[PDB]
Symmetry: D2
Subunit: 395 residues, 4 copies
């Protein structure tokens, strides 16, 4: 029916965009809001807002389990830490939102999709490269980037058209079950430290002095499946570790990162459950993956994180890396014990039915099975090519 399908968050800009897009294009607007565990307002209140702001149809998709299962678990399996710091909090959800917006377009006669991203962020890239890969036939509208859009203009438009919207905190927040990101003007200066007011997912790391939390996280083929012996879904694992890590101030990040669009920016993140899961998963790989496979997998972990940050979730390199990763995870099964305390994650135990750790090869005790007679010859040949090079250097 030649609709515009709007990725709808419930905020001022996308709410005004509904009738603004209607006027600019002459088309009806279907609002699509995704529950990723962002909390705050009930999703029905968001759904209703889009209707009151002129959407012909307004839908909520509960994608929390899908987000955990199909986006967060892959990030865990590639130990994804952008800059070796950031578990891709905002980046991971964008391809999922894209997927559902395309699906909604097929269902509701949409020929255009729209998003409210700005022109100096990464999110525009993640949305628009995604749309171009999944549905190039759809026109993509970026009203906030491409149409001389300002808050004042949006508010003036809302006033002129009696749009029922709240137009009344200096924090720019993005949160979901995987983590929370905070931008504020004060923190754009790199010598300014964050204050307690920036935080929500986590308690101050000083709170629980005599009550550390020791937790055991179990994985089966790279997927988190248990906490302290209790079976859990991936969403439940993330939520429980968000709570337990958050109570210990774990996962507070303060990062200067390279945006794909050419600039550095400073951001604050809270990602307690994510950091516990990625740390544990890494420790389990050290127990279950052979040396040279592990060395190379640190390269593919890094590449994967870059691809997803760079808006290339749907790229063929990312997809092929997933086939590599799936094979590596076959035996990544076992339990990792960590103490959560003081904002810190401290591993102190591992066990695995797929362990490559061999006590008898490692021990000096009576059970020692390592044949040391091999070592002299190994060292001689291991060192030979660089020895020959050194001789030449010195000649």
């Amino acid at each position: 029916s030649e609709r515009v399908i709007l990725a709808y968050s419930g905020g001022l800009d996308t709410s005004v965009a509904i009738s603004w897009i209607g006027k600019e294009t002459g088309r009806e607007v279907v609002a699509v809001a995704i529950d990723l565990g962002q909390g705050g307002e009930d999703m029905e209140v968001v759904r209703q807002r889009a209707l009151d702001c002129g959407a012909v149809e307004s839908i909520v998709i509960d994608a929390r389990d899908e987000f955990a299962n199909d986006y967060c678990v892959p990030a865990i399996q590639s130990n994804a830490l952008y800059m070796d710091r950031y578990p891709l909090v905002s980046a991971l959800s964008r391809p999922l939102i894209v997927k559902h917006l395309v699906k909604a377009a097929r269902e509701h006669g949409g020929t255009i999709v729209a998003h409210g991203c700005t022109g100096k962020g990464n999110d525009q890239v993640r949305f628009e490269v995604g749309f171009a890969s999944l549905a190039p036939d759809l026109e993509v509208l970026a009203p906030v980037r491409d149409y001389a859009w300002t808050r004042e203009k949006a508010i003036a438009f809302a006033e002129e058209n009696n749009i029922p919207i709240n137009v009344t905190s200096p924090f720019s927040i993005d949160q979901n079950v995987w983590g929370r990101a905070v931008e504020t003007g004060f923190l754009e200066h790199l010598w300014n430290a964050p204050t307690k007011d920036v935080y929500s997912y986590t308690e101050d790391p000083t709170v629980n002095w005599s009550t550390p939390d020791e937790v055991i996280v179990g994985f089966e083929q790279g997927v988190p499946v248990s906490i302290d012996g209790r079976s859990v879904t991936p969403l439940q694992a993330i939520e429980e570790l968000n709570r337990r890590g958050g109570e210990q101030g774990v996962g507070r990040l303060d990062v200067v990162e390279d945006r794909l669009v050419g600039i550095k920016s400073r951001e604050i993140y809270e990602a307690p459950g994510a950091m516990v899961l990625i740390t544990a998963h890494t420790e389990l790989e050290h127990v279950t993956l052979e040396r040279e496979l592990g060395r190379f997998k640190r390269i593919t972990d890094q590449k994967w994180g870059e691809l997803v940050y760079d808006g290339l979730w749907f790229s063929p390199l990312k997809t092929a890396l997933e086939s590599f990763v799936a094979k590596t995870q076959e035996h990544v099964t076992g339990e990792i014990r960590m103490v959560l305390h003081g904002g810190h994650i401290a591993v102190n135990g591992r066990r695995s039915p797929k362990s490559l750790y061999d006590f008898n090869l490692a021990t000096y005790d009576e059970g020692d099975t390592f044949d040391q007679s091999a070592a002299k010859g190994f060292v001689q040949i291991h060192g030979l090519s660089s020895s020959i090079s050194a001789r030449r250097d010195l000649q």
Copy 2:
């Protein structure tokens, strides 16, 4: 006089090895003890012990500053973390010991060098590849690996040959320590479900002890070298020692790692490296402010490779040497200060400043001073996504 040059630590085993090597080879032994900040017994007491055990010469080399400057600083510049966990505590010192043992051989007429490493560790590799690179003419003697030299054989030899040595009780800990960090291996910790207890720690206090007084510290670098702490100029050795103290008081740098040995097996070790972890963390944060994006992405690859080379006994290899040329160029503008809070066993960055910053407030900000030209973005996104879009179209066709 065709001497044996012994890498001498002062321990019972290598002490009795001096006398034993003398009888078994008929050669004179020169003991060389290197001060790397291992503490323990005074070096002169160590030096004398070798003499009393039959060494014809016994020397001590104070290499603490050389170690910090020429080994620890390179590790900082490559953010060296083996397994992404371990800043190479025991690995770093080995090439420096090799260098000095070779120098001692040339000066004291040595034709044989000896070490006390075992046959299932990495240190044998680091020593012997080093010797093969720096001085292939020297024969290498490894009594522990190749001639079954044990504590028992040593205690027995010293009693049978009336060697004036005091036999110390056996420790449950296998410990290697220097100014850069401390490594602990115990039988109990060979079981991966056993957690360490407080008795394995020495360099660091439990995080709970000084919990009430978090320590905010500023570390300054110039061209990738640590040069100041809280505004005070320091040498690299002083930087390491001060941050060992301050991080140690906060329980920072406690590591518990299952690592891949080059000799094909996994093993579990405890490390304490408070100063090293503060320096490497701060250095990494400073590179995020001062190195361009794609240079940074590739340097994480070379950082990893460098750590592997040094772990694998390849400090002197031509790839390691060539990576150092790459690293030196990258460090030219790695100058600035990083502010961190040490608390709870954790290092928390909360500030950066740099006269070489690539951060541009006006390009990043949303305030009135915003200079970012957003008109470029639509086109950038179209072309950045185009090759994968074409691939997707083919996939779906």
Copy 3:
């Protein structure tokens, strides 16, 4: 029955080894000879020789198709060129020989396997790492390396025990359907050029002046499946291109390579079919694989070739790379036209039903669909981070 299973090539050393191993160990010997297309003597003549030299059982395994399908085709799919020169001629067959020797051990009550490799080559590594991965319970005997073995000693042993064996050319040859390797004393000097006598698989590149051979090689999901429109099996593809490439002197290689055991050595190879197949497969990937996937796949191609050279065919990194490769090959389907002439392979045509080449995006003709309005903005942001770095450098 506590047998030794010998990897049996039919030569002097392994023939004498049969009764020598029998005396040294007191065990019966099962000889296992693999047909990899090495030609020369009929395989039955080889089988019979082992019996006459004292083997209790002697078997021939015809593994030519298996070698092509399961070892050569993976090498094609990773464009495997060691040193960017050598398509792993001798390296590829070793894991296959290992596989069949282990199988024979299970069938014939073998507790020991034996091979005739020397101590300064790569082949000992490929055999023994393979045995250690597939069957660590088997003792591995290396009589030629570990038992003070010399040709004179072997001949003296044969004389003393009346072993019926030929004990009478200075070439050290290893050949199979994938290629031919030649070692000779004269060529151990790097300023010595090879003479015509070193060659067998290929004609001199000067022969066919006015009769070049244009060939079309077709692939389906990375597997060679046609030549000049004719369907072929992978073995048939290799054999036909060996012939056609060989007639044009294609695939003559002269390489200084790094052995895993620490030394450089000089070797001559003939690999006409292999080089045609790998060249064509590479050209087809340039047509069918997206840019950044191709850039990364050149890294995995190199790593794969190193792993196989280094005796790590069965390693978990190699196996995981195969999962990566399998995904990349999904659309590597199409035909590559090349001229074979003068020792050279010259591509001059491609076609593919899975092509990523878009004529209309590339052309300047009337059909041009490239939107150039995007380019200014792309260049501005692509260049921004290094521009900012340059500004800092210059300040």
Copy 4:
């Protein structure tokens, strides 16, 4: 005087662009023509044409040696082959043109630089990223991409404004050539099942022509720089030109490539680069003789990355610059001679010699002089294979 500095090739389009830019901007134009060995019209004829078309100044820079020394030699040292096919013919010259255009701007009071690249090629990127790095104060004008400047608009403008220019017939070939190689694009070859015909070639003869007389050539390097041919000393430019001639006579360096443009599309191009391919082939062979194994493995990674950076318009990027520091160290011992036969369009190596060789005859040989200690091999194999053996055991358990 707020001049426009025009990267001037001498072609019809940019010639009329001079006059057109003058009227459209009211600014004076300075034309800068760079001699990179493109041949064709005499540079002074080119220089004069710009003046006749209204340029206030017209200069010619002979950059042939600078190009060989500072751009082609780095490409040789990184064995630069884009797609593992293309030695960057057109990509290499762009940063050198940028440098000279910036220098000309400073000298002649230019505030604007202009180029004639299109919006779907790589050259726009190489020019504009270059300008943004070297001289961000300069405005960049791109008439072809941004102001619809075409041949037709040029032929029309020159007739309407009485411009004293001779209008040459359109070529079916889009050609870019310099001393390093030649690139040809034709409509016919935009179809991937069309083979090139003899008329697309110029730098090289058909391989059949001189088939009866194969050319054996020795190329010598010193620290990775080509310095001799058949014993005769040469400059890098002389090396390139001589091997262009000798390889060209044998049909060497004919390339036909489907490549990935940075702007997201594939395209098909023909190249002729006889001298470049001989030099890069020889340089690679020499590294196999003079660089240690693991250094060589990693350098194939940096070789690939360097070629990508330069293709992608990132010659001036800090990763490229840092890789150059890595490369310089690797080249220290890349000294020696490589003997090849040029014939049949093919380059066939058949000899190497080097005073810095890592080849050791006695370690390799099976003759009586054999020095390889085989007793080390069994142990090496046991430990080399151990981690994958343990993994296999777990897999099978």
